[PDB]
Design an enzyme around this catalytic site. Structure first.
Site, PDB file in Angstrom:
ATOM      1  CD1 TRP A  67     -21.951 -30.702  15.753  1.00 55.51           C
ATOM      2  CD2 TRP A  67     -20.694 -32.515  15.374  1.00 55.51           C
ATOM      3  NE1 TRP A  67     -22.688 -31.804  16.108  1.00 55.51           N
ATOM      4  CE2 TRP A  67     -21.943 -32.931  15.896  1.00 55.51           C
ATOM      5  CE3 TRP A  67     -19.714 -33.473  15.086  1.00 55.51           C
ATOM      6  CZ2 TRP A  67     -22.267 -34.267  16.118  1.00 55.51           C
ATOM      7  CZ3 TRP A  67     -20.037 -34.812  15.304  1.00 55.51           C
ATOM      8  CH2 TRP A  67     -21.289 -35.188  15.843  1.00 55.51           C
ATOM      9  CB  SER A  68     -17.095 -25.143  14.531  1.00 51.50           C
ATOM     10  OG  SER A  68     -17.999 -24.243  15.183  1.00 51.50           O
TER      11      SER A  68
ATOM     12  CB  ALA B 218     -15.487 -20.740  18.317  1.00 53.25           C
ATOM     13  NE  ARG B 219     -10.833 -15.762  21.885  1.00 56.47           N
ATOM     14  CZ  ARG B 219     -10.033 -14.854  21.357  1.00 56.47           C
ATOM     15  NH1 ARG B 219      -8.948 -15.199  20.662  1.00 56.47           N
ATOM     16  NH2 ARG B 219     -10.319 -13.568  21.542  1.00 56.47           N
TER      17      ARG B 219
ATOM     18  CG  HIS C 148     -19.544 -23.158   8.741  1.00 56.51           C
ATOM     19  ND1 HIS C 148     -19.042 -24.400   8.307  1.00 56.51           N
ATOM     20  CD2 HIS C 148     -19.512 -22.321   7.663  1.00 56.51           C
ATOM     21  CE1 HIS C 148     -18.769 -24.279   7.024  1.00 56.51           C
ATOM     22  NE2 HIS C 148     -19.025 -23.032   6.564  1.00 56.51           N
TER      23      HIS C 148
ATOM     24  CD  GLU D 121     -19.119 -29.255  10.659  1.00 51.02           C
ATOM     25  OE1 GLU D 121     -20.355 -29.159  10.921  1.00 51.02           O
ATOM     26  OE2 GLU D 121     -18.407 -28.273  10.210  1.00 51.02           O
TER      27      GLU D 121
ATOM     28  CD  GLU E  79      -6.003 -13.811  19.538  1.00 48.17           C
ATOM     29  OE1 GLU E  79      -5.190 -13.338  18.622  1.00 48.17           O
ATOM     30  OE2 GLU E  79      -7.173 -13.238  19.831  1.00 48.17           O
TER      31      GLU E  79
HETATM   32  C1  LIG Z   1      -8.151 -26.483  16.910  1.00 50.87           C
HETATM   33  C2  LIG Z   1      -8.675 -25.143  17.346  1.00 50.87           C
HETATM   34  C3  LIG Z   1      -9.425 -24.418  16.457  1.00 50.87           C
HETATM   35  C4  LIG Z   1      -9.817 -23.095  16.708  1.00 50.87           C
HETATM   36  C5  LIG Z   1      -9.551 -22.559  17.959  1.00 50.87           C
HETATM   37  C6  LIG Z   1      -8.828 -23.312  18.940  1.00 50.87           C
HETATM   38  C7  LIG Z   1      -8.391 -24.611  18.616  1.00 50.87           C
HETATM   39  C8  LIG Z   1      -7.647 -25.485  19.577  1.00 50.87           C
HETATM   40  C9  LIG Z   1      -8.598 -22.531  20.238  1.00 50.87           C
HETATM   41  C10 LIG Z   1      -7.530 -23.073  21.215  1.00 50.87           C
HETATM   42  C11 LIG Z   1      -9.914 -22.547  21.010  1.00 50.87           C
HETATM   43  C12 LIG Z   1      -8.115 -21.119  19.882  1.00 50.87           C
HETATM   44  C13 LIG Z   1      -9.180 -20.354  19.155  1.00 50.87           C
HETATM   45  C14 LIG Z   1      -8.586 -19.222  18.207  1.00 50.87           C
HETATM   46  C15 LIG Z   1      -7.516 -18.398  18.622  1.00 50.87           C
HETATM   47  O1  LIG Z   1      -6.332 -18.543  18.121  1.00 50.87           O
HETATM   48  O2  LIG Z   1      -7.766 -17.727  19.704  1.00 50.87           O
HETATM   49  C16 LIG Z   1      -9.380 -19.417  17.046  1.00 50.87           C
HETATM   50  C17 LIG Z   1      -9.213 -18.846  15.683  1.00 50.87           C
HETATM   51  C18 LIG Z   1      -8.551 -19.622  14.758  1.00 50.87           C
HETATM   52  C19 LIG Z   1      -8.803 -19.518  13.385  1.00 50.87           C
HETATM   53  C20 LIG Z   1      -9.710 -18.595  12.933  1.00 50.87           C
HETATM   54  C21 LIG Z   1     -10.367 -17.775  13.831  1.00 50.87           C
HETATM   55  C22 LIG Z   1     -10.125 -17.888  15.186  1.00 50.87           C
HETATM   56  C23 LIG Z   1     -10.699 -20.436  17.360  1.00 50.87           C
HETATM   57  C24 LIG Z   1     -11.716 -19.540  17.814  1.00 50.87           C
HETATM   58  O3  LIG Z   1     -11.739 -19.100  18.947  1.00 50.87           O
HETATM   59  N1  LIG Z   1     -12.590 -19.081  16.837  1.00 50.87           N
HETATM   60  C25 LIG Z   1     -12.721 -19.571  15.589  1.00 50.87           C
HETATM   61  O4  LIG Z   1     -13.595 -19.092  14.863  1.00 50.87           O
HETATM   62  N2  LIG Z   1     -11.987 -20.614  15.200  1.00 50.87           N
HETATM   63  C26 LIG Z   1     -11.117 -21.142  16.095  1.00 50.87           C
HETATM   64  N3  LIG Z   1     -10.531 -22.361  15.728  1.00 50.87           N
HETATM   65  C27 LIG Z   1     -10.578 -22.753  14.322  1.00 50.87           C
HETATM   66  C28 LIG Z   1     -11.856 -23.360  13.838  1.00 50.87           C
HETATM   67  O5  LIG Z   1     -12.159 -24.513  14.606  1.00 50.87           O
HETATM   68  C29 LIG Z   1     -11.813 -23.744  12.359  1.00 50.87           C
HETATM   69  O6  LIG Z   1     -11.611 -22.545  11.611  1.00 50.87           O
HETATM   70  C30 LIG Z   1     -12.998 -24.503  11.828  1.00 50.87           C
HETATM   71  O7  LIG Z   1     -12.903 -24.627  10.425  1.00 50.87           O
HETATM   72  C31 LIG Z   1     -14.322 -23.902  12.256  1.00 50.87           C
HETATM   73  O8  LIG Z   1     -15.411 -24.786  11.883  1.00 50.87           O
HETATM   74  P1  LIG Z   1     -16.448 -24.350  10.715  1.00 50.87           P
HETATM   75  O9  LIG Z   1     -17.564 -25.364  10.875  1.00 50.87           O
HETATM   76  O10 LIG Z   1     -16.827 -22.923  10.960  1.00 50.87           O
HETATM   77  O11 LIG Z   1     -15.706 -24.533   9.415  1.00 50.87           O
HETATM   78  N4  LIG Z   1      -9.987 -21.266  18.259  1.00 50.87           N
HETATM   79  K   LIG Z   2     -15.887 -27.667  11.191  1.00 50.60           K
HETATM   80 MN   LIG Z   3     -18.806 -26.372   9.395  1.00 58.80          MN
END
Ligand SMILES: Cc1cc2c3c(c1C)C(C)(C)C[C@H]1C(C(=O)O)=C(c4ccccc4)[C@]4(C(=O)NC(=O)N=C4N2C[C@H](O)[C@H](O)[C@H](O)COP(=O)(O)O)N31
Ligand SMILES: [K+]
Ligand SMILES: [Mn+2]
Ligand SMILES: Cc1cc2c3c(c1C)C(C)(C)C[C@H]1C(C(=O)O)=C(c4ccccc4)[C@]4(C(=O)NC(=O)N=C4N2C[C@H](O)[C@H](O)[C@H](O)COP(=O)(O)O)N31
Ligand SMILES: [K+]
Ligand SMILES: [K+]
Ligand SMILES: [K+]
Ligand SMILES: [Mn+2]
Lengths: 500, 500
Positions: free
Chosen positions: B166-167, B169-170, B188, B230, B279
């Site tokens: 689980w993370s 990221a845009r 990841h 996660e 960013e």
């Molecule tokens: C709180 C937050 C967070 C974040 C983000 C956000 C928020 C609100 C937004 C609004 C959507 C913005 C965006 C950016 C910008 O500023 O555009 C970014 C950057 C930052 C640094 C680095 C490279 C890139 C992000 C994307 O896209 N990609 C990636 O890759 N990452 C990331 N992040 C980080 C992360 O979450 C960590 O690092 C973990 O740790 C993961 O998980 P693992 O499982 O692999 O370990 N994003």
């Molecule tokens: K994470």
């Molecule tokens: Mn992870």
């Protein structure tokens, strides 16, 4: 007499401004006065005037603390400095520094000698004073002496008579009729001392005037050029010739309205223990005593109800930041421009403990130079770090026209995001270093040499075709009409004054 | 359901805390929502809930901005983060980070599968939705797309089933049924993507859940170790097994109370235009489009009256500072301790645009190591800069026990006064660099390599015999009884609440 031309009038001005607290109950010069003043400086409170100082006798002396420190409100933050200069209390830093630079391409206005003044209202000869019997403050608990001198002006003249320097340098009581103090290169008091030492015939005629015209203490704290008599610079800046009186026991001249004047000599042969002292960078190293210059006092003259100004210096924010940093930055701005470098503004960020100066670059002019970061960093650092104006400054940060160098948050943002560590920097090890910075005099390398850097926070296209970004902020990442709609509907929607 | 375990309950919590502004008049997702949210973030105002979003149809969707941003008061500055975790709203940063680390030496608590939940209240198949017809925000005026995904959690699983990541990221809308987004090493989502690419047989089964349990979005933003699921970490941290439901069209599992769920695939072969985006470091480079990963959406499920959380990121202070910086710093603190380095605390100063981490050293333990700055800098930088937890961080600042690393002013003071440029630093050019920092990806050197430094702001005697200074501040340069007298007489004398 105008506030900028008379310390006594400056004190009234602070009262009028609701920027003074008069303390009429007994206050101890052993730490208590300076602790109050320290707290004021760390919280931007009103300046304290200690009218009932334990140990004051026959008029010597009251203390004013924090004379050049900051006010709490943003609108008149620098109001105390403005009051040194006849500027409106809302003056910007830019306006203050421009006022301090204005005399640099004006003819000096030499001082006017007058036959007497308030500084002659009382006198004590060498049989009547004892400096150990005055209420001299202990400013920090580990200081190596009682620092009588934190906001007066030393007056010394070249042997040939052509240059009279006014400057601030610390000094502490040694014994009943001597001080010791810092006299170090490349400072003008040191340069003049050297001249007398080479001549080898006599000790240096000297005076130390406390509670001088505020415009004069400002210049005393600025690195105006070698050979330039501060009195005539202040005359040009203020548009008025300063009124001076002759000392009784030597032929130097002191401001007519000086609160307290010491007359005597700066030895060309003797030294004595000096320091340690709680210094501008926020530290004291207890027990670090070294030999300093030794001054003999022959005579004291003073105003009725004399006031001694005092800087309780150390961590932010006091005179050692607002005046040392800012006035060095002003001189560096001019120095860069006179060397044909496209610098518009300079400031020493308080966040850097005034060890950095941010240099705002006119990037239109930079682009026409058709240069590169390496070359430009090298040129800027050579100009600044080989000059006395750059002595106290260990990091220069180059920023483009979008950055307001007087805003530390914006300098920090630019430095952190636009200057690649190492690659975008040039280190300078063969330049004079500032030993008072802890990482110099108490650090891993030579106390007096190197440790300087130019950090280029200009982005690559600033050298070629122009800025190629917009900030991700409210100002730059939304069109004008939308921003104004948001502002106009802000409180209506439920979200949350200039003077505060 | 508890606020930390249910986004809908978190929104009520912010209302209860008087930390929400509900906006029931029409607001445009084209810039207006994000401009309001930007202003909130730059002024630490209350979080905005846009209940009447122009373009919302059949329940999709409301927006909550600034879910993890700062409150104005010092006492509950980090209250929004505390509300992610069941902590009192006055919790310190140290307590928040300790809560986020607590699961690191606990057995995971695996999730519990339940047959349904609020995220199944509504559904749209591939003939019923069009992502270009939803009220997806344009967050910054020069963004290269409408960023639907700024505060949801991507869910991907290793081919062998053993690790579900689980993370955050845009991602932005590409067309009616695809997104493009950032999928970059060493993250990841990228590591797992690589596994599927090497296998070469199919696109990656994927889900993106918006408005997930707040404790889960916190872990989604933290670099917990490789291979660690996660869900089980959050289970251990909260002391409760998270309730998940199966996706309709794949065998991944999403939080039962997710506001909005996208189900589909992350391609192992296709790319599409992604960015530019405003960013975390405070910039957008207009026109800087590059190819990003491409996601196909097959199904949407969502709660009645669904709420989409949104980060209007850029200049200080938003989720990209409070969560990315702080959670990386937490993981780095642990990583250092597990490598036998005497680090007590770590924080990414906001002033550094979360590109620095300050490391507080137990200098008693340092002294017993009988080492030197060069050696210790090298050891610390090797540990941190060769690890994924150090990816986003380009400067480490080593400080002794007197510095509170959670206080940027004190970090800046120590850095500026205790670390000699050059001599007290070690540069690292052969480590992975963070390309999103402008001086990396838009700078003078390799976008992906080097530009890192360890800056030693330990003083020499901190390695040998002990600190050899006192600060020149009110706290340290005056005895206890005097300080208390000054404080006790402060308002009486004429000088100027915790909650506020
Ligand atoms: C709180 C937050 C967070 C974040 C983000 C956000 C928020 C609100 C937004 C609004 C959507 C913005 C965006 C950016 C910008 O500023 O555009 C970014 C950057 C930052 C640094 C680095 C490279 C890139 C992000 C994307 O896209 N990609 C990636 O890759 N990452 C990331 N992040 C980080 C992360 O979450 C960590 O690092 C973990 O740790 C993961 O998980 P693992 O499982 O692999 O370990 N994003
Ligand atoms: K994470
Ligand atoms: Mn992870
Ligand atoms: C404002 C002020 C100032 C000052 C001071 C002060 C104040 C308040 C006190 C408090 C007293 C402190 C102290 C210190 C400490 O911190 O301790 C110091 C240091 C600082 C830097 C450097 C070195 C030292 C003084 C001394 O001592 N010495 C010297 O040398 N100087 C100085 N200063 C500076 C100056 O004034 C300039 O620089 C000009 O510019 C001069 O003039 P010319 O003419 O030469 O140019 N100081
Ligand atoms: K001067
Ligand atoms: K640069
Ligand atoms: K150091
Ligand atoms: Mn001078």
């Amino acid at each position: 007499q105008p506030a900028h031309l008379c310390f006594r009038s400056f004190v009234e001005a602070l009262k009028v401004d609701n920027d003074l607290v008069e303390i009429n109950t007994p206050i101890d010069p052993n730490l208590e006065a300076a602790a109050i003043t320290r707290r004021v400086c760390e919280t931007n409170d009103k300046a304290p005037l200690f009218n009932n100082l334990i140990g004051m006798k026959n008029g010597l002396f009251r203390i004013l603390g924090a004379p050049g420190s900051l006010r709490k409100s943003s609108a008149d933050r620098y109001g105390r400095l403005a009051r040194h200069l006849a500027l409106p209390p809302t003056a910007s830093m830019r306006e203050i520094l421009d006022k301090m630079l204005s005399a640099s391409d004006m003819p000096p206005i030499p001082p006017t000698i007058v036959p007497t003044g308030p500084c002659k209202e009382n006198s004590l000869d060498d049989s009547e004073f004892d400096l150990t019997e005055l209420p001299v403050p202990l400013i920090h608990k580990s200081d190596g002496g009682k620092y009588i001198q934190t906001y007066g002006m030393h007056i010394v003249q070249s042997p040939d008579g052509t240059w009279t320097n006014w400057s601030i340098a610390r000094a502490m009581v040694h014994d009943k009729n001597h001080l010791t103090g810092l006299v170090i290169p490349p400072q003008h008091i040191w340069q003049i001392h050297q001249m007398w030492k080479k001549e080898g015939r006599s000790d240096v005629p000297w005076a130390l005037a406390f509670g001088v015209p505020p415009a004069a203490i400002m210049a005393s704290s600025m690195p105006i050029p070698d050979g330039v008599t501060e009195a005539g610079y202040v005359g040009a800046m203020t548009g008025s010739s300063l009124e001076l009186v002759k000392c009784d026991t030597n032929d130097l001249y002191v401001p007519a309205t000086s609160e307290i004047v010491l007359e005597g000599t700066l030895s060309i042969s003797e030294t004595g223990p000096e320091g340690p002292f709680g210094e501008m960078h926020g530290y004291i190293f207890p027990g670090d005593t070294h030999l300093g210059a030794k001054y003999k006092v022959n005579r004291i003259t003073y105003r009725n109800n004399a006031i001694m100004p005092m800087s309780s210096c150390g961590r932010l924010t006091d005179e050692t930041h607002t005046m040392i940093g800012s006035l060095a930055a002003a001189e560096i701005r001019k120095l860069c421009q006179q060397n044909d470098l496209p610098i518009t503004d300079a400031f020493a960020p308080f966040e850097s403990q005034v060890t950095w100066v941010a240099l705002r670059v006119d990037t239109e002019k930079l682009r026409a130079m058709k240069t590169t970061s390496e070359g430009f960093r090298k040129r800027v650092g050579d100009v600044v770090f080989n000059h006395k104006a750059g002595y106290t400054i260990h990091r220069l940060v180059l920023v483009g026209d979008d950055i307001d160098v007087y805003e530390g948050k914006d300098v920090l943002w630019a430095f952190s995001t636009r200057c690649r560590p190492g690659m975008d920097e040039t280190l300078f090890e063969d330049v004079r270093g500032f030993p008072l910075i802890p990482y110099m005099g108490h650090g891993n390398g030579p106390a007096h040499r190197g440790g300087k850097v130019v950090s280029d926070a200009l982005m690559p296209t600033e050298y070629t075709t122009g800025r190629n970004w917009e900030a991700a902020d409210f100002n730059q990442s939304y069109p004008e009409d939308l921003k104004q709609k948001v502002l106009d509907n802000w409180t209506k929607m439920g979200f949350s004054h200039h003077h505060h």
